[PDB]
Structure formats: C-alpha cells, structure tokens
Design a protein around this motif. Structure first.
Motif, mmCIF file in Angstrom:
data_model
loop_
_atom_site.group_PDB
_atom_site.id
_atom_site.type_symbol
_atom_site.label_atom_id
_atom_site.label_comp_id
_atom_site.label_asym_id
_atom_site.label_seq_id
_atom_site.Cartn_x
_atom_site.Cartn_y
_atom_site.Cartn_z
ATOM 1 N N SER A 1 0.775 -1.261 -0.050
ATOM 2 C CA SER A 1 0.097 -0.016 -0.029
ATOM 3 C C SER A 1 0.774 1.192 -0.100
ATOM 4 C CB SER A 1 -0.850 -0.105 1.290
ATOM 5 O OG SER A 1 -1.704 -0.948 1.139
ATOM 6 N N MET A 2 0.362 2.216 -0.647
ATOM 7 C CA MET A 2 1.006 3.687 -0.623
ATOM 8 C C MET A 2 1.074 4.393 0.577
ATOM 9 S SD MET A 2 -0.962 6.622 -0.657
ATOM 10 C CE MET A 2 -2.939 6.551 -0.770
ATOM 11 N N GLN A 3 2.155 4.979 1.088
ATOM 12 C CA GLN A 3 2.237 5.366 2.370
ATOM 13 C C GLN A 3 2.214 7.088 2.717
ATOM 14 O OE1 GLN A 3 1.656 2.175 3.581
ATOM 15 N NE2 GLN A 3 2.773 3.291 5.409
ATOM 16 N N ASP A 4 2.193 7.696 1.295
ATOM 17 C CA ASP A 4 1.799 9.085 1.120
ATOM 18 C C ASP A 4 1.060 9.591 0.027
ATOM 19 O OD1 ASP A 4 1.893 12.013 1.962
ATOM 20 O OD2 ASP A 4 3.939 12.051 0.429
ATOM 21 N N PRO A 5 -0.017 10.025 0.112
ATOM 22 C CA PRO A 5 -0.604 10.531 -1.003
ATOM 23 C C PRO A 5 -0.032 11.921 -1.639
ATOM 24 C CG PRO A 5 -2.159 10.856 0.814
ATOM 25 C CD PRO A 5 -0.799 9.913 1.356
ATOM 26 N N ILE A 6 0.600 12.465 -0.789
ATOM 27 C CA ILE A 6 1.101 13.869 -1.229
ATOM 28 C C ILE A 6 2.089 13.836 -2.189
ATOM 29 C CG2 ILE A 6 1.877 16.046 -0.609
ATOM 30 C CD1 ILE A 6 -0.876 15.882 0.222
ATOM 31 N N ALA A 7 3.196 12.588 -1.909
ATOM 32 C CA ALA A 7 4.077 12.605 -3.008
ATOM 33 C C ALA A 7 3.614 11.851 -4.248
ATOM 34 C CB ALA A 7 5.305 11.625 -2.479
ATOM 35 N N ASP A 8 2.525 11.077 -4.102
ATOM 36 C CA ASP A 8 1.650 10.719 -5.160
ATOM 37 C C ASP A 8 1.197 11.806 -5.878
ATOM 38 O OD1 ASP A 8 -1.055 8.849 -6.288
ATOM 39 O OD2 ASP A 8 0.924 8.075 -6.272
ATOM 40 N N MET A 9 0.591 12.715 -5.526
ATOM 41 C CA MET A 9 0.032 13.982 -6.086
ATOM 42 C C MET A 9 1.036 14.617 -6.795
ATOM 43 S SD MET A 9 -2.163 17.287 -4.322
ATOM 44 C CE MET A 9 -0.650 17.700 -3.220
ATOM 45 N N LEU A 10 2.291 14.776 -6.252
ATOM 46 C CA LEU A 10 3.398 15.381 -6.847
ATOM 47 C C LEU A 10 4.028 14.539 -8.018
ATOM 48 C CD1 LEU A 10 5.389 16.946 -3.705
ATOM 49 C CD2 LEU A 10 3.210 17.996 -5.022
ATOM 50 N N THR A 11 3.762 13.196 -8.009
ATOM 51 C CA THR A 11 4.423 12.457 -8.996
ATOM 52 C C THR A 11 3.373 12.464 -9.976
ATOM 53 O OG1 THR A 11 5.235 10.832 -7.397
ATOM 54 C CG2 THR A 11 5.034 9.916 -9.533
ATOM 55 N N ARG A 12 2.069 12.395 -9.945
ATOM 56 C CA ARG A 12 1.117 12.421 -10.762
ATOM 57 C C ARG A 12 1.441 13.862 -11.479
ATOM 58 N NH1 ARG A 12 -4.335 8.946 -9.687
ATOM 59 N NH2 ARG A 12 -3.181 7.414 -8.078
ATOM 60 N N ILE A 13 1.578 14.962 -11.177
ATOM 61 C CA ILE A 13 2.090 16.157 -11.709
ATOM 62 C C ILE A 13 3.187 16.135 -12.628
ATOM 63 C CG2 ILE A 13 2.805 18.654 -11.561
ATOM 64 C CD1 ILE A 13 0.998 18.655 -8.609
ATOM 65 N N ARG A 14 4.212 15.684 -12.213
ATOM 66 C CA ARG A 14 5.455 15.836 -13.086
ATOM 67 C C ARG A 14 5.462 14.464 -14.236
ATOM 68 N NH1 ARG A 14 8.035 11.812 -9.084
ATOM 69 N NH2 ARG A 14 7.512 12.969 -7.324
ATOM 70 N N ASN A 15 4.710 13.560 -13.832
ATOM 71 C CA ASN A 15 4.479 12.443 -14.940
ATOM 72 C C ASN A 15 3.593 12.988 -16.088
ATOM 73 O OD1 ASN A 15 5.925 10.393 -14.195
ATOM 74 N ND2 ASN A 15 4.316 9.263 -12.699
ATOM 75 N N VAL B 1 -5.557 15.649 -14.800
ATOM 76 C CA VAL B 1 -4.813 14.698 -13.722
ATOM 77 C C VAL B 1 -5.657 14.482 -12.518
ATOM 78 C CG1 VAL B 1 -2.863 13.976 -12.189
ATOM 79 C CG2 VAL B 1 -2.528 15.381 -14.603
ATOM 80 N N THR B 2 -6.322 13.279 -12.435
ATOM 81 C CA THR B 2 -7.268 12.736 -11.406
ATOM 82 C C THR B 2 -6.517 12.105 -10.113
ATOM 83 O OG1 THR B 2 -8.012 10.618 -12.434
ATOM 84 C CG2 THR B 2 -9.117 12.859 -12.665
ATOM 85 N N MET B 3 -7.213 12.149 -8.815
ATOM 86 C CA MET B 3 -6.804 11.659 -7.668
ATOM 87 C C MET B 3 -7.727 11.764 -6.538
ATOM 88 S SD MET B 3 -3.831 14.595 -6.347
ATOM 89 C CE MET B 3 -3.649 14.746 -8.397
ATOM 90 N N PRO B 4 -7.953 10.814 -5.608
ATOM 91 C CA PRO B 4 -9.006 11.083 -4.615
ATOM 92 C C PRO B 4 -8.723 12.469 -3.842
ATOM 93 C CG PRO B 4 -7.322 9.037 -4.062
ATOM 94 C CD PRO B 4 -7.150 9.794 -5.380
ATOM 95 N N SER B 5 -9.764 13.366 -3.420
ATOM 96 C CA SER B 5 -9.723 14.407 -2.892
ATOM 97 C C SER B 5 -9.528 14.489 -1.362
ATOM 98 C CB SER B 5 -10.744 15.598 -3.241
ATOM 99 O OG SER B 5 -10.476 16.745 -2.740
#
Lengths: 71, 80, 150, 123, 129, 205, 82
Positions: free
Chosen positions: E1-15, E24-28
């Motif tokens: 399981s992922m342990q930080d959704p904030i670094a996920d959000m930043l990763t979804r930005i740079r990708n 770009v979508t993610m759970p709010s």
RNA sequence: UAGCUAGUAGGUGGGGUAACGGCUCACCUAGGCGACGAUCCCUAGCUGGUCUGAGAGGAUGACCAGCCACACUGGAACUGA
RNA sequence: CCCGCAGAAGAAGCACCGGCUAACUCCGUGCCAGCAGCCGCGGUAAUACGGAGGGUGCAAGCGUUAAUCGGAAUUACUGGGCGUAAAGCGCACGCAGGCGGUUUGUUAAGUCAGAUGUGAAAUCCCCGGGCUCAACCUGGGAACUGCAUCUGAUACUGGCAA
C-alpha cells in the motif's frame, strides 16, 4: 660519480637457481650468488652451468656476484 | 506553580513502590529522525493505589531511598 | 569577434594489421562573452590541423545563455555521463573559482565571478556538455514571467 | 542506505593505518644495527642497492635503505632512522640519515647538501 | 500500500507534465486542495476542481507555456519517514526566489515567500521549480 | 628582507618593465625587453594556465617589492572586507608608506623611497616612521625632516619628479618638502596593467 | 570572602588591570564573580583609562565586600569628580 | 562480552550523618536492571576551546581559564569552619 | 626612548628545474654508480644519475621526515551505490521496531511564534582605541547555532473520542 673499486675475477658456474640467479664458485673466493647482467637479457642470451665466466664482486657485500662476461 | 511530567506505569508493584516509564520525543541530531526516548523512574505513592498501564502525573521530591526521588500526584483512568 | 580557446589534446591509436597509427583529438570552446557559447571536438592526422577542424565545428552548435552583471541567474546543477557539475552565482567581487576544463567553458560565456565544482568523473569530454546542459536550462525572472504570474 | 537503518547502526570510518611501525608520533628513532647487504631490486630495474638490518631501540627489527655513494657503516653502529618507502626493493620503509651519529656524510658531494650530510665547501 | 498520497500527487503532476496531458485525477482531501490552491496562486497549474460525494475526486488541469511544460520539476522534501521543520529565520528559498516552496504553518498552507512575510515557520512539503 | 638582486632581470623575465631603475632615462639599450634573461630565453615560452597565474602574482609583488608572507597578510585582510578582494588588495599595497613617497616624488625609486623611510627621513603627521609597510590614512600630511632636508638625495629626485603623470588621489604640494594624502585610490585611478581576478584566483586552490 | 581587587591580564612590561569582584582564596588570574572596571596605569593621552561602575561597587560594599588598597585609592581618585 | 544482581530491589523499625538516603543494622516481602545495549573487557581525565573544513562534519583537549582526581606503594583516623 | 660620531663599512642562504609543476644545455658514468612522492629514468649523444654553467621558487630561514584534517561525494545526514564492475539473505510466515487511507470534534505532546532567566570570563567575529606600525594589547557591541520555565498560535503530525 662512480668509483672503480669493484673487482672482477673469474669462476665456474656450479648451479642455476630460479630468476636467472647462479651459484658460481670463484677461483680464490668462496661460492657466491651471482645474478646475470643486463646485456645478456638485452641481446636474448641464456647460459648454462659448468662454464667459466667473469664475475664482478663488490667489497660491500661479498656474497653477491654479477655475471658480466659471456659464456 | 510546580513543574511536573506525565508517564505510564508498565511495571510491577511493591509496598509503597511503583516504577514509571516516561516516553518522550527527541530529534536525533546526526540523522534528523524523531526518536522515542524512555525515561524510567522509581516513584513514591499514596499507599500503592495505582494499577498497571495507566497514565500518571508525577513530580520531584526529596530522596526517599535509592533513586526514589519522585512522587505521584494524579492518575488518569487507572488500570484497564 | 568571438573568444576562442582549446581545453586539451589527446592522442588515440586505431591499431590495425600493419601496426599502430596515431590520430589526435582536440577539444575547443568558443563564446561571445555575452552568452553565445559553442564547442567543437575534432580530430586529425597531425596536431595543427586538429585544432582548426575543432574550431570550425565550434561555430555552429551555439547556445544562448542568460547573464547578469558578471554571473549566473540562480544556482544550477548539471550532469552528463559520469560527470556531475555544480555551480552557484556568488554575485559581485569574488572572482571565478572553478575546476579544470570547467574554467575554459565557463569563462567564454562571459561570467567574471562564479563558484563551481566538479563531482563524479572529471574526464574533459564529459565535463563538457554537462556544463552546456546546466547553462542551457537556466531560468531568469523574465523567463518565469513569460510562463506565469508577475 | 535507509535513514532508520543509519539511526540503528551508524556509518563507520576506515582505520587509516600508518606506513611505518616506527610510529609513536616520532620523526626520528635510534637503533644499533647488525648486517649490511647489497640486494637486487625487482626485475624492471637492475642494480645492487645498499640495505641494512636495523634493530631499533624499541625492540623492533626492521630493514632500511642506505642512500648516497658508499658508507662507513658496518657491524654494531648507532644510526638515525627516518621514514620513506623505496618501492623497487622488497619491504624497505625506512632510510638512514647520512652525516648523523656513527654515519659518514657523502665525501665529494657538492649539490643538494640538505641530503647526504655535507657542510658547505669554503675556499 | 502507498504511504503518502501527497508525494503521489506530486508524482502525478511531473508524470502528467512530461507526458503532456491535460487532466490529472486523484482522490480528494483538504491538504491536496490547499496545495493546489498555492500552485494556482503562484501560477504553475491552470485550475483545480473536485467532483464526488462518497469518494470525492480532485481533477487538476495542467498548464503549458508552449510545447514546453510550465513546471520544471517538483520533489517531496519532507517525507513520511523523515520530518523536516523550518523556523522563521531558517525558511529556505528555491532557486534564488524564482521557484517557491510549500510550507504548512500554524496559519495554514503558504509559500516560503508568504511565510517570511507572515513571520512564522513550520513543516516544508516540497520545492516547486 | 628585500630582493637585493639585479633589477632589470625581473623586468626582462616578466616581459614588461617594473620601473625599478628608471631615474635619468627610460633607456631601451640596457633593458633588452622581451628577450628574456639567461641562455635559453630566446625560444617562445608557450606558458601554462597555472604559469600565467603564477607570473601575475610575481609581476604585482615585484612592483611594490614585497615578500610572499607579508603579501599574504594583505590578501587575508582584503578578503575579509566587503567588496572586491583584488581592489582591496591593491588599495592596501598602494596605502604603504614607502609607496606614497614614490607617488609624491620625494624619492627617485621605490628602493630609494624604502631607504629614506628606513633611514628616518620621512615623517607622517609629525611622527617619524621607520616601518615601510605602515598603512597611510586619509587626511595624512607627510614630510621630510630637517637632517635629510636639502641634501643631494632629495634634490636630484625633485627635478626628475616633474616628468611623471601625477596621481589623482593625493595633493602633491612639495614647494617646501611635504605632501598630503587626501583619499583612497579606486580601480579607475590606478593602472590598467593588473588582471585583478587572476591574482586573486591563484590563492583559491 | 568577597574582595574588590585588581587582576592583571595585560602584556609583559605593559600591565592592564581589570578591577574585579572575587573571593580572596582564588588566585589573582583565577575564578571571579564579576568584572566592574579597568585601570590602565601605563595609559595614553586619551581621556578614557580609569573606569568603574559605582552602582556595582556600592552594591558590593553593601553586601559587605572589602576593597584592595589600589582600588580604594582609585575610587577616592575618581570620586563623583576627580 | 547476553544474561547480570543478597544489602542486590522495596517496605517497616532501630542506629548513623551537618542533611536526604540500604548510609549502616535487625526483621519482613520478592523483586531490581536488561537489546533505547545490562554486565564484562580494552582504551580514555572532562569541558569553555584549539586545529582543519564552504558548511555540515572530522580530528583533538598543549598553552590560557573552570572543575574533578592523585601526592614513594597499601590502609586508617585525628585536629579543625 | 632620543641625540651624536665614524664609514658601504659589520651582516644571504636553501631547495628545485622528464610529466604532474613555475623553471635547460654540456660534460662524466654506461641497467654500473645511483635517483625516485607518483607514473618511472640509467644497458654510449641521460633536458630525470654525478659535476659545471644558466634558470626558477622562498627567505633568516630553507628542505626532508613524522603527526592531523583537507582534496575524498573514497562511510556519501546535508552528499553515494547494490542487472552484468565490490553489493539483494535460498525462500516464506511472523513477534519487538519503523511507517500509515479518509471525515469531524478535542487536546496542544511534537512542531511553530513571542518574552523572561540562563548560555562564566578569555577565545572566535565586527566596529573602535593605544604600543614607530604590525604581530601583540585593549574599549564597546554582536556572537555564544544551545537549554529550561512561562504566555500564545493550531495548518501539519502524534495522543484521545466518534
């Protein structure tokens, strides 16, 4: 600069060791460990026991000869 | 006002005697991690009425015997 | 006209049926002192021919670099192959304090004071281009103003 | 490495051992010596080079290069012993100091007299 | 399981910026919106949006200068396993002020520039280049 | 202390004159400039990037006539001060007492200027000052005292002094053997010979 | 017990005294309670050279501290006015 | 070097000290410490600092100053604030 | 500390010069003698040995050696790696330990803000002053990155409740 106090005298080659090193018995002196000189290695010459060679000896260490002259 | 600390028992119980492990948080200076430090203290009490595993307020006093220089004051939700 | 210079020359053998045969590889940098940085890597059978062929290639491959006062806009990092090059602007006074190979490529761009250091490989061919990549990406207040905000 | 692991077990520097067992924060030591040979170097070079077995005053037997042109040294003789490897010979990590204690300087040497122990020519 | 959704959000930005995508979508959540608001304030992203109820879903519209992305890069500076706190004196500056950081102060989610003007510090999140 | 050797060899090695002799005439015949001293100096040098830094250190040092340890002390003071280090370096060197005597033209040469300050001819604000390295202040009068006044030494110097282009940061005076140091040199006032980032660069490694 | 006294930190053949509040048992250069002034006997033509905060010295006299004979002389030198 | 501790851990009472105290005794209970490194071994006077280093760090504790310890080896008390 | 007298009179050495690394030729010796920090030089034309001339660096010091840090991102927190170069346990389940989706309330531990006390003096640093100047000495300020207690803030993390 070099001084001419090294002595050259003859001996029969008794036995060939490793490393181009030879057990040479002089005429007056004892049997001494002699390495071959640069010149023989340079002109691709190898030698064999039972033959009579000129062997340079230093007064500092009288146990180390130098095989100067040819077979 | 007095200064005071809060810790938890997590220890056996003897005649007028209880030990109190006090967990705290310190930044570890080389690597910057926040690491849990454990400060164990022997404590004097009001006739050993505390349980085990609950959270007790504590404060400093005279030595009452070897290392027993603290005394308890109030307990939140004793035992379990 | 522009400022030209060479970093180093290195001898290289092909090695073939008839024996060894020795080429010469030069490395050259040019710049106008106002950006307009360009470099050339050339080779030849004899030495004075090699540096001319390198300097010919140095005319094209020319890139525009932001410059203010006598230094860089902001701290920049750049990497090429094994060679990691860091640098910082160090505004006014100061002079240039910078590595081997780095000093030639850095100076022709037109900085007069600047801090830089080579990590990793310091091999001249990969120390070059790591530098050009660091100089090329570099931003400015005008460049950020173009894409966002004030 | 992972930061929790570095908290658990920290980084550790190399031991950084010295080249000279003579050590002891000393530049110079003393010894009484025994034997002076002239041994061959490794095969890429050739010569007979002057080397001495120094028994040090701290009880260590070590071997030491003799620099300069000839020497008076023999048998029981007290010499000064500084560091410095000679790589062409086997295991020699020391040099005798010429013009000190029982050692002669190099007679008729004119240049570089900081080495070889020679007071300046006057005429 | 992922342990930080904030670094996920930043990763979804740079990708997304690298692949040149728009939406770009993610759970709010709250801090995801509050960081995206700082991105729109400084000017890096086009617009944020949220749609849902049982699972709210943040939709981030990316932005392009030319064929080139507006964002150069974005990295998670404080991380779950290692927390970084910056005091009022110690507040950093990204690329000589050209970039911004994201900092969570007592008075909310700010930039380093806004936190210097506010006069307080806290947990730095990420460096927006 | 002091170089003490032949003066022209340093100018010939550096390849630009250092003004060390240069009293009666700026003579071409003696100097032999750009031919280098000694046997093999005829050949083209093809100098290194380290060598052009090291040469410029010697070129500046040999003008003022300083030794490396004293010269290092000026570099340490120039570095800690705000602003450009090379300029604050040249300011401290120009601020020397033996240098101001050459600038006022009381002495013919920098060596004769150092001789006069050592021989206790020169007084600053009515103190006598032995030390050549002495740091002159803004608002400093300077003068020759009575024993050294109107000798053949100063009198020949004041004649050949007129030829010079005349400094912009001091008042010359000298109708009665004195001078006044008004204000600091700045980069524009001082010569264009020195490459100032370059000399500072060499101490960085 | 507490004494007001002159301690010498200055260079060889140029004494610069530091008048200071200290216990009697401690050495001259040693351990002390607080500094209170300075005394340069070598001096220079400048106005500064003897200085002593009188609110401090009168406080320590009030707590019962005794005064070394040089410091006693320097107090009765500087007074309110010299 | 992974188990170590009987005055060891706690209580009551007596004695002791300028004064808290297993400080020291009698009696009672069975605990204490321990992987956030106990215990054991090797090595070491500590710190304000010095030296180096862009900083972070590293090495180090002469001189100056603060503090502790020791006074031929081993042990003890007197006098006295 | 100052004045006077005499007369250039009493006072310059040391290392290095093949590349790295600023600075070159000849002669002697001939893989010998010896040099060498590193890579290496010398076996008959040695810019690397020995001597001489010339040159370069530094100065009442110079050089060598030993000792420490730097360069060394070569123990890499800042600031490194682990397909084939040194490096992923043979594989799995698991306690202690690390870390944790999303919503609200609350606490204020961590964290962030302010204030007070304290952080000896000397040192270090800055602006000044005094010894012919400097070294050295010294006035004042700043510094002493710290810690404790109290009063505040509540975004984030932790505790607690749903």
């Amino acid at each position: 600069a070099k001084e001419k106090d090294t002595i050259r005298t003859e001996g029969v080659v008794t036995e060939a060791l490793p490393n181009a090193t030879f057990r040479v018995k002089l005429d007056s002196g004892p049997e001494i460990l002699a390495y071959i000189s640069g010149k023989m290695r340079m002109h691709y010459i190898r030698i064999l026991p039972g033959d009579r060679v000129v062997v340079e000896i230093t007064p500092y260490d009288p146990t180390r000869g130098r095989i100067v002259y040819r077979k | 006002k007095i200064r005071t600390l809060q810790g938890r028992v997590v220890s056996d119980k003897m005649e007028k005697s209880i030990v109190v492990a006090i967990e705290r948080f310190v930044k570890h200076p080389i690597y910057g991690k926040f690491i849990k430090r454990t400060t164990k203290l022997h404590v004097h009490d009001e006739n050993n009425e505390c349980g085990i595993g609950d959270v007790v307020e504590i404060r400093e006093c005279r030595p009452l015997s070897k290392t027993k220089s603290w005394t308890l004051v109030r307990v939140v939700e004793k035992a379990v | 006209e522009l400022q030209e210079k060479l970093i180093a020359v290195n001898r290289v053998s092909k090695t073939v049926k008839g024996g060894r045969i020795f080429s010469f590889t030069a490395l050259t940098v040019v710049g106008d002192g106002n950006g307009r940085v360009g470099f050339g890597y050339g080779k030849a059978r004899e030495v004075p021919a090699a540096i001319q062929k390198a300097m010919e290639k140095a005319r094209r491959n020319m890139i525009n670099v932001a410059l203010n006062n006598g230094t860089l806009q902001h701290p920049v990092k750049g990497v090429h192959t094994g060679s990691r090059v860091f640098m910082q602007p160090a505004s006014e006074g100061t002079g240039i304090i910078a590595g081997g190979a780095m000093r030639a490529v850095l100076e022709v761009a037109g900085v007069h004071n600047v801090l830089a250091k080579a990590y990793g490989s310091t091999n001249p061919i990969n120390v070059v281009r790591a530098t050009i990549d660091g100089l090329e990406n570099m931003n400015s207040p005008e460049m950020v103003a173009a894409k966002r905000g004030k | 490495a992972t930061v929790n692991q570095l908290v658990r077990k920290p980084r550790a520097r190399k031991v950084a051992k010295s080249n000279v067992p003579a050590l002891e924060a000393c530049p110079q030591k003393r010894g009484v010596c025994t034997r002076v040979y002239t041994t061959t170097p490794k095969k890429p070079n050739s010569a007979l080079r002057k080397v001495c077995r120094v028994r040090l005053t701290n009880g260590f037997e070590v071997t030491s290069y003799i620099g300069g042109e000839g020497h008076n040294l023999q048998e029981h003789s007290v010499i000064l012993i500084r560091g410095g490897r000679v790589k062409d010979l086997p295991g020699v990590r020391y040099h005798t100091v010429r013009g000190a204690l029982d050692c002669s300087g190099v007679k008729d040497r004119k240049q570089a007299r900081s080495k070889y122990g020679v007071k300046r020519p006057k005429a | 399981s992922m342990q930080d959704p904030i670094a996920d959000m930043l990763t979804r930005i740079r990708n997304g910026q690298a692949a040149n995508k728009a939406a770009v979508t993610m759970p709010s959540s709250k801090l995801k919106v509050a960081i995206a608001n700082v991105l729109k304030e400084e000017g890096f992203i086009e617009d944020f949006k949220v749609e849902g109820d049982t699972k709210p879903e943040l939709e981030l519209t990316l932005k392009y200068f030319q064929g080139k992305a507006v964002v150069e890069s974005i990295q998670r500076v404080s991380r779950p396993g290692l927390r970084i706190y910056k005091r009022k004196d110690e507040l950093p500056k990204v690329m000589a002020g050209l970039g911004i950081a994201v900092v969570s102060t007592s008075k909310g989610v700010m930039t380093d520039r806004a936190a210097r003007q506010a006069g307080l510090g806290g947990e730095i999140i990420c460096y927006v280049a | 202390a002091r170089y003490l050797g032949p003066k022209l060899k340093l100018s010939r090695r550096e390849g630009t004159d250092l003004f060390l002799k240069s009293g009666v005439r700026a003579i071409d015949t003696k100097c032999k400039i750009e031919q280098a001293p000694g046997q093999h100096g005829a050949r083209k040098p093809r100098l290194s990037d380290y060598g052009v830094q090291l040469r410029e250190k010697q070129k500046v040092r040999r003008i003022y006539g300083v030794l490396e340890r004293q010269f290092r002390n000026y570099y340490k003071e120039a570095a800690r001060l705000k602003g450009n280090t090379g300029e604050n370096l040249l300011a401290l060197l120009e601020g020397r007492l033996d240098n101001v005597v050459y600038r006022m033209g009381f002495g013919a040469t920098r060596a004769e200027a150092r001789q006069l300050v050592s021989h206790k001819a020169i007084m600053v604000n009515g103190r006598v000052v032995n030390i050549a390295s002495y740091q002159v202040s803004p608002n400093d009068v300077v003068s020759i005292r009575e024993k050294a006044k109107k000798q053949s030494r100063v009198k020949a110097a004041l004649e050949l002094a007129e030829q010079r282009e005349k400094p912009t940061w001091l008042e010359v005076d000298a109708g009665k053997m004195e001078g006044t140091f008004k204000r600091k040199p700045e980069r524009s006032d001082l010569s264009a010979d020195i490459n100032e980032h370059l000399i500072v660069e060499l101490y960085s490694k | 017990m507490v004494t007001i006294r002159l301690a010498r930190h200055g260079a060889k053949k140029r004494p610069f005294y530091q008048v200071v509040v200290a216990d009697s048992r401690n050495a001259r250069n040693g351990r002390f309670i607080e500094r209170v002034g300075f005394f340069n006997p070598i001096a220079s033509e400048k106005e500064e050279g003897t200085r002593l905060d009188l609110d401090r010295i009168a406080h320590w006299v009030g707590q019962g501290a005794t005064i070394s004979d040089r410091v006693a002389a320097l107090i009765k030198e500087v007074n309110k006015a010299a």
